Design a binder for this molecule. Structure first.
Ligand SMILES: [Ca+2]
Ligand SMILES: [Ca+2]
Ligand SMILES: [Ca+2]
Length: 314
């Protein structure tokens, strides 16, 4: 929040913003520049106030009006920015249902409290439980892992550290995998879904005291396929959530064109949470800024919108 790139605008005036956006929408050809400039420089909560004031004045819902007025990747970004975080995450989950990397990315990186609100909003929008949908769309151990993660019931022992449990969990992960001939997948799932993220960072550290390979290397040796890929993503997300996002951003822009669904989703969803840490990890790893990469990979008003969500560079 302190680590978000998008901050609450000072001296906020919803009605001013709604008049200005209406004018922009009705400009011949559409004044996209103004729409992007405003909405990318307001908090999500402020955008809700703007939507409310817009409908009151015009008798049109802002999101509907913008669906009609905008298109292409610009439209995706702007409509995503208008959704509340829970609505946005719920709708991105639904869209990922199959895209296992994206389901992990969303589910691994939200708080318990965000996950409860996502579950509630998902049922409301889609009239089915998120967990029922996951069970439908997935199978085997990846289904078990996803179901467990989606419940959003990681332990929350403030950060009162339990050094004994850290050690026991680390030994248990080792005994369940690298120490023995097969792999006890339910034990890995249990530990990695039921403990807090800070606890698990310490477990993975302590783990190295017992295992000749770190957690990521152990995963590579112990499991295969979709489930291997899922655990690797999950462990990265736990060990360093900003670097995880930075790597997903870099990968979204590599080579020819862009995986715009991923890029958009990250820039919208992490804009008010940790985009400054993501930037910092990205620059540290890749040498140039996130801003520089977005700028080289996208164009037009869509690019401008994403560069505002990035927020600049250091
Ligand atoms: Ca235009
Ligand atoms: Ca083994
Ligand atoms: Ca590219």
């Amino acid at each position: 929040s302190a680590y978000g790139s998008v901050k609450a605008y000072t001296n906020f005036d919803a009605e001013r913003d709604a008049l200005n956006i209406e004018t922009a929408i009705k400009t011949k050809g559409v004044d996209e520049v103004t729409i992007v400039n405003i909405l990318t420089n307001r908090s999500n909560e402020q955008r809700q106030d703007i939507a409310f004031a817009y409908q009151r004045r015009t008798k049109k819902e802002l999101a509907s009006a913008l669906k009609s007025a905008l298109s292409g990747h610009l439209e995706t970004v702007i409509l995503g920015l208008l959704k509340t975080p829970a609505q946005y995450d719920a709708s991105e989950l639904k869209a990922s249902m199959t895209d296992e990397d994206s389901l992990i990315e969303i589910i691994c990186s939200r708080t318990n409290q965000e996950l409860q609100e996502i579950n509630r909003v998902y049922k409301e929008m889609y009239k089915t439980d998120l967990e029922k949908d996951i069970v439908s769309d997935t199978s085997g151990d990846f289904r078990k892992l996803m179901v467990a993660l989606a419940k959003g019931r990681r332990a929350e022992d403030g950060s009162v550290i339990d050094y004994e449990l850290i050690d026991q969990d680390a030994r248990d992960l080792y005994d369940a995998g690298v120490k023995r001939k097969g792999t006890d997948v339910p034990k890995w799932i249990s530990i990695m879904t039921e403990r807090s993220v800070c606890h698990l960072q310490k477990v993975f550290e302590r783990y190295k005291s017992y295992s000749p390979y770190d957690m990521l290397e152990s995963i590579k040796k112990e499991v295969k396929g979709d489930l291997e890929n899922a655990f690797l993503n999950l462990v990265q997300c736990i060990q360093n959530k900003p670097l995880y996002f930075a790597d997903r951003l870099y990968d979204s822009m590599k080579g020819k064109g862009t995986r715009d669904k991923v890029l958009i989703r990250i820039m919208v969803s992490r804009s008010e949470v940790d985009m400054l840490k993501i930037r910092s990890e990205f620059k540290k790893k890749y040498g140039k800024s996130l801003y520089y990469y977005i700028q080289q990979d996208t164009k037009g008003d869509y690019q401008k919108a994403l560069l505002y969500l990035c927020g600049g560079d250091d």
